[PDB]
Amino acid sequence: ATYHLEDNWVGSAFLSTFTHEAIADPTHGRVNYVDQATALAKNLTYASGDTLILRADHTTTLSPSGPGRNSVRIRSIKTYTTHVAVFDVRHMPQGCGTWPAAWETDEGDWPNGGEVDIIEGVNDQSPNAMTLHTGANCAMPASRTMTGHATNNNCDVNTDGNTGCGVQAPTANSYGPSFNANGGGWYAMERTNSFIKVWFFPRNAGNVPNDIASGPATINTDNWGTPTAFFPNTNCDIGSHFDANNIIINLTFCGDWAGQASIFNGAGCPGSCVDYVNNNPSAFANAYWDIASVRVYQ
Numbered sequence: 658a659t660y661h662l663e664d665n666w667v668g669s670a671f672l673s674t675f676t677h678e679a680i681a682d683p684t685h686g687r688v689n690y691v692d693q694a695t696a697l698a699k700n701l702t703y704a705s706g707d708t709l710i711l712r713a714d715h716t717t718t719l720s721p722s723g724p725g726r727n728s729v730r731i732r733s734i735k736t737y738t739t740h741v742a743v744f745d746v747r748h749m750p751q752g753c754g755t756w757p758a759a760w761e762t763d764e765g766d767w768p769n770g771g772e773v774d775i776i777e778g779v780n781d782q783s784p785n786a787m788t789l790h791t792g793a794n795c796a797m798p799a800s801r802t803m804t805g806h807a808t809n810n811n812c813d814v815n816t817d818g819n820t821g822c823g824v825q826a827p828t829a830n831s832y833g834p835s836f837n838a839n840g841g842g843w844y845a846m847e848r849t850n851s852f853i854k855v856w857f858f859p860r861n862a863g864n865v866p867n868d869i870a871s872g873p874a875t876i877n878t879d880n881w882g883t884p885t886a887f888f889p890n891t892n893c894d895i896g897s898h899f900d901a902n903n904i905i906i907n908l909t910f911c912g913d914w915a916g917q918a919s920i921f922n923g924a925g926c927p928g929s930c931v932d933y934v935n936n937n938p939s940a941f942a943n944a945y946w947d948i949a950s951v952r953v954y955q
């Protein structure tokens with residue numbers, strides 16, 4: 658479980674090693690995903706020094722008949738199979754209606770190339786969820802060694818209500834306003850032929866592996882303790898359900914998950930998600946990622 662540095666992305670490096678996906682939102686959110694040039698001009702992406710900011714427009718009041726709220730979805734140019742990805746995240750988007758994610762997939766053959774969601778949630782609702790979405794014949798055992806709590810254990814999007822097989826992180830500060838109040842933290846995901854693991858370490862953790870915290874060129878996941886989420890191959894050939902995946906980091910609003918009235922209102926968010934997103938630009942001033950680095954090891 659020893660790996661060596663493959664990519665080191667800090668600040669302006671993201672502008673040449675990722676693209677912006679100016680696409681209709683696959684999750685049907687109240688979002689307008691802008692291109693890279695537009696993002697940089699409007700300061701929705703800011704990539705300089707040791708900082709990457711990816712943010713929502715927090716100034717425009719939207720025409721209800723016009724496009725959704727400007728935001729960004731960035732995708733690594735490179736693809737990865739067996740690897741470790743480490744995200745040093747100072748801030749993640751918050752606010753009613755927000756649906757941020759840091760994840761990997763192969764968009765071109767989804768879901769057959771797999772999807773792993775590393776950071777994901779909606780409407781400020783902690784804790785973080787870590788989830789696989791696959792094609793047929795991929796499930797997880799009811800009990801396996803991890804610190805998080807399994808929810809759905811069938812990863813097949815065709816037969817699991819499109820939920821994937823998920824794990825909830827054990828602490829509130831894994832996600833949302835709680836995470837942001839704490840200065841964020843580190844997410845690491847190891848993928849091999851035999852498993853996927855995710856670890857979360859809060860910013861203030863006394864037990865964060867130096868491997869993760871300082872980003873040296875050599876790491877050893879054997880020394881990282883029990884993962885937060887564990888997806889073993891007991892009932893899923895992991896390698897046959899995943900192919901070469903890009904890393905994606907995005908922020909959408911409302912849409913198929915966050916926008917459901919019961920879910921949005923259940924989070925303490927008033928009224929209509931789309932109406933809220935249209936008419937409360939200032940409420941998205943804290944709907945930003947602040948990323949110190951993303952590093953991949955192979």
Ligand SMILES: *[C@@H]1O[C@H](CO)[C@@H](O[C@@H]2O[C@H](CO)[C@@H](O[C@@H]3O[C@H](CO[C@H]4O[C@H](CO[C@H]5O[C@H](CO)[C@@H](O)[C@H](O)[C@@H]5O[C@H]5O[C@H](CO)[C@@H](O)[C@H](O)[C@@H]5O)[C@@H](O)[C@H](O[C@H]5O[C@H](CO)[C@@H](O)[C@H](O)[C@@H]5O)[C@@H]4O)[C@@H](O)[C@H](O)[C@@H]3O)[C@H](O)[C@H]2NC(C)=O)[C@H](O)[C@H]1NC(C)=O
Binds near residue numbers: 668700708747
């Ligand atoms: C487009 O959008 C961008 C992004 O939002 C806008 O940029 C912001 O612009 C505003 C206004 O100009 C800036 O506000 C100013 O900030 C000044 C201070 O900046 C310096 O410190 C910042 C905080 O750094 C600490 O915290 C971070 C973690 O969050 C640590 O990494 C860092 O080490 C610092 O830690 C110290 O403090 C903490 C406690 O707070 C301790 O625990 C630690 O031990 C340390 O003691 C920091 O964010 C700034 O970094 C920026 O600049 C440096 C180069 O100078 C660069 O390397 C970084 O990558 C980053 O770009 C900086 O070090 C302050 O003096 C002033 O009053 C005002 O508040 C704001 O900093 C900008 N944010 C950025 C750049 O991320 C931009 O304006 C907009 N463009 C437009 C309008 O055209």
